[PDB]
Amino acid sequence: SGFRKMAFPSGKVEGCMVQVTCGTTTLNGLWLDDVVYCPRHVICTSEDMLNPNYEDLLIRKSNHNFLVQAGNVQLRVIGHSMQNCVLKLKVDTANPKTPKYKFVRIQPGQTFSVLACYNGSPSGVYQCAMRPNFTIKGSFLNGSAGSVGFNIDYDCVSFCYMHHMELPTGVHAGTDLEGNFYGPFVDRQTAQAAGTDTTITVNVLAWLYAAVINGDRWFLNRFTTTLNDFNLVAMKYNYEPLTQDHVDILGPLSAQTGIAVLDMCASLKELLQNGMNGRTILGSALLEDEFTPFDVVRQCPHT
Amino acid sequence: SGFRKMAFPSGKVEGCMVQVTCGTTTLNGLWLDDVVYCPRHVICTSEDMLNPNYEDLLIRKSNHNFLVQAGNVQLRVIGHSMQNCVLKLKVDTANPKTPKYKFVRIQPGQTFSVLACYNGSPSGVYQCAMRPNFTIKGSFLNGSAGSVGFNIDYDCVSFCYMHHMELPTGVHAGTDLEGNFYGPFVDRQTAQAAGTDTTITVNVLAWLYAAVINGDRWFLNRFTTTLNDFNLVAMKYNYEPLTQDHVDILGPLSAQTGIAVLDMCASLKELLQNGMNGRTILGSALLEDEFTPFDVVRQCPHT
């Protein structure tokens, strides 16, 4: 038993982590085949990061203005090209450690592992959710731009995130690996703020099921509710509407436990209106919403 | 900015996991140099599990009863020996991915990263603290025995935990990498109970400083206390006595914050007596203790 925020093993990402230096800006790049992906702000000087002309600053850069470094191996930079808000540095060496990979764009609600990295050195891995407002609540320090988020399914790494910047509120923002930002953010120094956040109801329901599957059942009650009666309580406490597809998605989990989706809603609704009265669920005093239904199933096979 | 439970990059350990099968039991082994380490109860079998005699069981075993598999390469067993609660299988192949490693017995309150494996294939990685009663609160299912737990320091993997079993209360237990169980536990399927847990005081303070570094400061005050005066309140709330050594350990986090350790003790005695009163600390409604002082420094370097 047990249930922990768990991240995929990072070994396959670790051998793609490299370090990129243009002038005195240093960050991390991703090394796939003979291309190295890095935030395009590595080309910006600390005096040019307010409203920068990226198309203009890149041309000036020659290849030798880019220092790429995988561990202590130097990589020749043979070409440079703009991939939206990221940069594709062509190198002379294909990464001998390139994993089977794909780039996918996640939707809000979905989760992924993050491999915190600094100066091309990975430092730690942990599990994040793409919030409804397209930020993520991670732990990135200065120079961690270029750390990536990935899901690993069987053997194929799906890269879904590349960290770019911190919002003035402490949350983080980045692009997919095709260089397109998540949400309404730009890679300039403006007064961007995260949209107002909301809780991801399906993930809480999923995690409630994970609690039941592990023998935490004190919150279960005899009431039941209509989707719409629930969703109006959901609106009140800043929670996303639950849709029929969510209820479909919660199907498998509802059958492994034999607790109707709408019966669990009745528990969640009680918990939002009255609180937990000093109890905890799966070790937490708060409702956790960064576990997808698929994530619950990984640690709780039906068997 | 940001602060989240963070596992070490697991890539150096992934390369050591193998699957070990004896008879009809399968679980994970640790392939270092020319030896595979796994739990000794792989040689257990149905006939007797409440009082298996392991000398008798091992004596009924030859080298070719142990099947070792590393990816898609079968290792052949050259010799087998028993060391406390752990098996060492000599294989004909040295692991060409063996990291720089050491075997350490962690002390109660210390933390390590677990790399859950099933069938010698890693599955995920997360942070875990050896509870003062020598159990860990992990996420483990049948067949994950042999999953190890480690710290990483300058590319040296300090192995500290190997998973063996789950107690009736749902917490887990295992040996160090020398086969000696953390705690008063035996590797029998008999009902065994851990002592009463306690909260790890010095870890909690280390969390509180991590909250201050991240801008949650609402719990501070100007009061102060004594080690002796504070340790009284710790006893009432089932906290571990705090020692001068803990105060010295927190030294580096006190400098980074400007809050003397005993001023932070005053802060924490206030939290125990009057609850968090609806607020949260680093997005938690409870006091966390699975964060070592060093673990905070790691995620929040100062200068």
Author numbering:
A (entry chain A), B (entry chain B): 1 to 303
Q: What do the study authors state?
A:
The main protease of SARS-CoV-2 (Mpro, also referred to as 3-chymotrypsin-like protease or 3CLpro) is responsible for the majority of nsp processing, cleaving at 11 conserved sites along the polyprotein including self-excision of Mpro by autolytic cleavage of its own N-terminal and C-terminal autoprocessing sites. SARS-CoV-2 Mpro is a functional homodimer of two symmetrically disposed protomers that are each 306 residues in length (33.8 kDa). The active site of Mpro features a Cys145-His41 catalytic dyad, which orchestrates nucleophilic attack at the carbonyl carbon of the invariant P1 glutamine and the formation of an acyl enzyme intermediate central to efficient peptide cleavage. Using C-terminally substituted Mpro chimeras, we have determined X-ray crystallographic structures of Mpro in complex with 10 of its 11 viral cleavage sites, bound at full occupancy intermolecularly in trans, within the active site of either the native enzyme and/or a catalytic mutant (C145A).
An additional structure of C12 in complex with the C145A mutant in the same isomorphous crystal form was also characterized here. For cleavage site C12, in which we have captured complexes within both native and C145A active sites, crystals belong to space group P21 with 12 protomers in the ASU, four of which create dimers with bound active site complexes. Native and C145A C12 variant crystals belong to space group P21 with six dimers in the asymmetric unit. In both, the C-terminal C12 PHTVLQ substrate sequence is clearly resolved in the equivalent active sites of four protomers. We propose these observed motions and destabilization in the WT context, are necessary to effect substrate product release which must occur efficiently post cleavage. These observations contrast with the binding of C12 to the C145A mutant active site, where the lack of the Cys145 γ-sulfur atom allows a more optimum interaction network between P1(Gln) with the oxyanion hole, S1 subsite, and His41. Comparison of PF-00835231 and nirmatrelvir binding to the common substrate interactions identified here explains their potency and rationale for the drug-development between the two compounds. Both mimic binding of substrates with P2(Leu) (C12 P4-P1 TVLQ overlaid in Fig. 7a, c for comparison with acyl enzyme and product structures).
